[PDB]
Design a protein. Structure first.
Lengths: 283, 249, 240, 124, 119
């Protein structure tokens, strides 16, 4: 093509590559803090699990964890998605997984409903008209417990009110800086655990019902927050990896364009010299 | 035995005139119609500047040839020939000039082969750190549009690069003595200037020159006499004494 | 035409204007005639004597002790690239360049003058005034920052980054739209009468818009209106 | 109407490039997308179809005034053709006034016919 | 000769739609190369999905080429070409693997080739 076209194309690719590099740097920076936030939150959930594995009292009267298995009514699905794109297969994986699984598991909208976190999830469930009832958007890039508690209290109360009697949630899991996996994990109506009897002291009066309603909603809240932190870490890792790949592709394209530009240069110089000499040879 | 400084305001116009003259004399054309000895023309010119040995008169002649490029086309015939001939180059960028870098000297594309022995020890002791800092800041200048990087050390590079750029800026027709350049570069490199606002650095350097004229005669005389940095502790004492009085605005 | 101007500046010492429209045609005609004259061709097919041919004409338009000629003359840039020898050689003779730019003209932003490429050695603090110099450099700076946002918002979006983005973007585009003035000549294309704004009013209105006296004013009020009072009047009319 | 149409299309041109990546585009600025698409569909015609200036300007007025922004982008061409047929059916006075005075007729008189065609028009 | 009054209205419409989809694919391929398939819009994803199949289906196995490869040639009438392309555009074969559209004759050959393959 023309030298001007090739040069402009090279410059545009260069600027896009630099912007993608900056985006990778900022994504890695945000990961550098999401990881430490998750690690700092881990001991709180450790404590809540330690407390939970005494309140069970074997076959207790708690309505939530005793595997009620009442006739299933409007199974609840919770999805954790990003507010912004440019993350590769992060959102597509979780949305395709939820869609493929719910299509096989259930048949009619009276048998399921959706809880949505993130802009892409709600936009998808709107354009494909699905029964979503509760959602939230534009969560801050490093969330705390207070931000999500407002929605999660209502989500747990929804099961408390004899609705959403079967509940599942989907979120990408931070397996590694390179690999992120989309897990499906059961929630409070299907509660199961392993630890045997122990002893501890935190409102440790043996009053079963009182400690029960003190703990179990807060346990669900803590588990939701931990899963959310995991999902955010996964989002940051996916974004940084995708931007690295974008920079690599841009570099390869720039290399090929430079080859084409050099060949065009030598062709143009040859043409100009030939024309000058031919014009001079006349007179 | 004297020393002569020669500046050619435009070599490209000489090249154009010689091309026109050759074409009118009906000599065989060449690459971009330039005659066959255009390179020899400029080699004859720029090879006469030299530093004579001791056995001859110990004089010297130094040259600063100028080249004018169109739209930054540094791949053209005459610019490439002159870059090949000359011992160095400095590249002034109009974009940097418009963005506020007044001398507009791009430290990336500017090289001097003689650089080194062509300096005094005081400036050689401090030049490498400044060059390294500016080279590192070059890449980081592409991240400043993002509000924050979550580690201070990387943002420290941005801050130090901004302070470097503010130090290196200068106004028309007010050259600075090399000793007063050495002192301010030392102040920048040793972190004395790192706590000063960017808009205030430019005023700070002039106030520092005034404070030097007040109470640094011994330091300036020592630099002039020995071409070497003064006592490091005494210099730090003087700089902190000035910072004790300069006020942030 | 130059001889007629020279008579006035020499015989009577007046101050004379010389408007030359598309001076590029002069060198183009020289290039057309050189080949037929029998001269050997030059780099891009131009004449060998392009530089001297331009210089003989241009150096006669200079101020003397008796009189002074000033000349406003347009340049045609073939293929919209400033690397061609004919527009390249004329740069050395100019003291002030007003670079009209496409992709500014494409939005109908008349007179399409680029605040970036426009340069003049008359812009110095001791000649134009310290306040004028400060305002000019400040508006150039705030317009500089905006262009860099364009790429990052092309890849992300306007609202992605918020680091003082509202303030900086507002400051930039309100001045950028304010630079466009309705011309008296522009009646032939829009019917709307033009306006004349002096330098004092210009710098004063720019000080106001820079400090934020009119931060809440609409963008279209800045476009093609002239003085700041006219801007606020038309904004009140359209914006109730 | 030429100036407003030109300015609207010119403004619509740029944001299409940014529309390929961003989802946070304002709903009010999505009206710009809709109007730009309507204009682009209006500015097409098939081979060997000369259109008189009066019917040429009536549809431009309807488009620039937003009288068809409620019709989907798919049906704009059928809107155009059946609108010309409707104007030939009823708009004789409008066409004659435009052809005679070279000026736009009273906005009320033409807007009534435009609204009548709107309520008559079926959408697929 | 590709005019509506010469080749037929349906032929003209099908040809124009095919060209439009191919042009859109050629426009999008730069973004696809620079930053991958992930960030495409859903409509653009379907456009690419059909454009690849159309581009493969435009291929054909000739009678002359029967010496380079063992596959015999095929003769495709205009009606069958138009019907097959219309069926592809209407979404009847969006579930087929895209390699089943390569070097085949009429449209039924695609279905039988795909059934012979892992489908």
């Amino acid at each position: 093509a023309s030298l001007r076209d090739i040069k402009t194309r090279i410059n545009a690719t260069k600027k896009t590559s630099q912007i993608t590099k900056a985006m990778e740097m900022v994504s890695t920076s945000k990961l550098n803090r999401a990881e430490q936030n998750a690690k700092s939150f881990v001991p709180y959930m450790e404590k809540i699990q330690e407390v939970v594995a005494n309140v069970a009292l074997g076959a207790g009267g708690a309505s939530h964890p005793m595997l009620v298995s009442r006739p299933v009514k409007k199974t609840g699905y919770l999805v954790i998605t990003s507010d912004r794109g440019l993350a590769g297969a992060y959102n597509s994986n979780v949305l395709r997984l939820v869609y493929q699984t719910i299509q096989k598991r259930h048949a009619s909208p009276d048998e399921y409903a959706i809880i949505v976190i993130g802009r892409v999830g709600l936009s998808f469930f709107r354009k494909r008209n699905m029964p979503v009832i509760l959602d939230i958007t534009r969560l801050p890039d490093q969330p705390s417990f207070a931000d999500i508690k407002e929605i999660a209290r209502k989500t747990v109360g929804l099961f408390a009110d004899g609705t959403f009697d079967e509940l599942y949630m989907y979120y990408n899991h931070y397996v590694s800086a390179i690999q992120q996996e989309v897990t499906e994990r059961k929630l409070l109506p299907l509660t199961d655990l392993a630890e045997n009897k122990q002893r501890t002291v935190y409102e440790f009066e043996p009053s079963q019902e009182e400690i029960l309603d003190v703990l179990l909603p807060q346990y669900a809240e803590s588990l939701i927050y931990g899963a959310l932190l995991d999902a955010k870490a996964s989002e940051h890792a996916a974004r940084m990896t995708a931007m690295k790949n974008a920079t690599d592709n841009a570099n390869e394209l720039i290399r090929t364009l430079t080859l084409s530009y050099n060949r065009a240069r030598q062709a143009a110089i040859t043409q100009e010299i030939t024309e000058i000499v031919a014009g001079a040879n006349a007179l | 035995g004297k020393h002569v400084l020669v500046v050619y305001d435009d070599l490209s116009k000489q090249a154009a005139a010689y091309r026109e003259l050759s074409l009118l004399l009906r000599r065989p054309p060449g690459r971009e119609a330039y005659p066959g000895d255009i390179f020899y023309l400029h080699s004859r010119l720029l090879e006469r500047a030299a530093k004579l040995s001791d056995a001859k008169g110990g004089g010297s002649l130094t040259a600063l040839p100028f080249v004018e490029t169109q739209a930054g086309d540094i791949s053209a015939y005459i610019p490439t020939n002159v870059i090949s001939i000359t011992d160095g180059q400095i590249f002034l960028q109009s974009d940097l000039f418009f963005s506020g870098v007044r001398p507009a000297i791009n430290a990336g594309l500017s090289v001097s082969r003689v650089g080194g022995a062509a300096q005094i020890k005081a400036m050689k002791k401090v030049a490498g750190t400044l060059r390294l800092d500016l080279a590192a800041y070059r890449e980081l200048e592409a991240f400043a549009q993002f509000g924050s990087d979550l580690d201070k050390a990387t943002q420290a590079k941005l801050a130090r690069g901004a302070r470097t750029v503010e130090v290196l800026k200068q106004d028309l027709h007010q050259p600075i003595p090399v000793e007063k350049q050495v002192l301010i570069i030392y102040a920048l490199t040793r972190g004395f200037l790192d706590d000063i606002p960017v808009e205030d650095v430019r005023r700070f350097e002039k106030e520092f020159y005034l404070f030097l004229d007040q109470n640094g005669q011994h330091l300036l005389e020592h630099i002039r006499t020995t071409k070497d940095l003064p006592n490091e502790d005494d210099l730090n004492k003087a700089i902190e004494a000035f910072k004790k009085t300069f006020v942030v605005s | 035409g130059l001889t007629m101007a020279e008579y006035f500046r020499d015989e009577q010492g007046q101050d004379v204007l010389l408007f030359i429209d598309n001076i590029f045609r002069f060198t183009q005609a020289g290039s057309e005639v050189s080949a037929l004259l029998g001269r050997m061709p030059s780099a891009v097919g131009y004449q060998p004597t392009l530089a001297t041919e331009m210089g003989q004409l241009q150096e006669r338009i200079t101020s003397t002790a008796k009189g002074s000629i000033t000349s406003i003359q347009a340049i045609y840039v073939p293929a919209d690239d400033y690397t061609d020898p004919a527009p390249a050689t004329t740069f050395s003779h100019l003291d002030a360049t007003t670079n009209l730019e496409r992709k500014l003209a494409e939005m109908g932003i008349y007179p399409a003058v680029d605040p970036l490429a426009s340069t003049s050695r008359a812009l110095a603090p001791e000649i134009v005034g310290e306040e004028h110099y400060q305002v000019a450099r400040k508006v150039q700076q705030t317009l500089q920052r905006y262009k860099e946002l364009q790429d990052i918002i092309a890849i992300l979006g306007m609202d992605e980054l918020s680091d003082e983005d509202k303030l900086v973007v507002h400051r930039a585009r309100r001045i950028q739209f304010f630079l466009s003035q309705n011309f008296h000549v522009a009646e032939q294309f829009t019917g709307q009468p033009g306006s004349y704004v002096p330098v004092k009013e210009t710098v004063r209105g720019f000080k106001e818009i820079l400090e934020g006296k009119y931060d809440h004013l609409p963008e279209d009020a800045f476009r093609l209106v002239g003085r700041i009072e006219e801007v606020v009047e038309k904004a009140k009319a359209m914006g109730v």
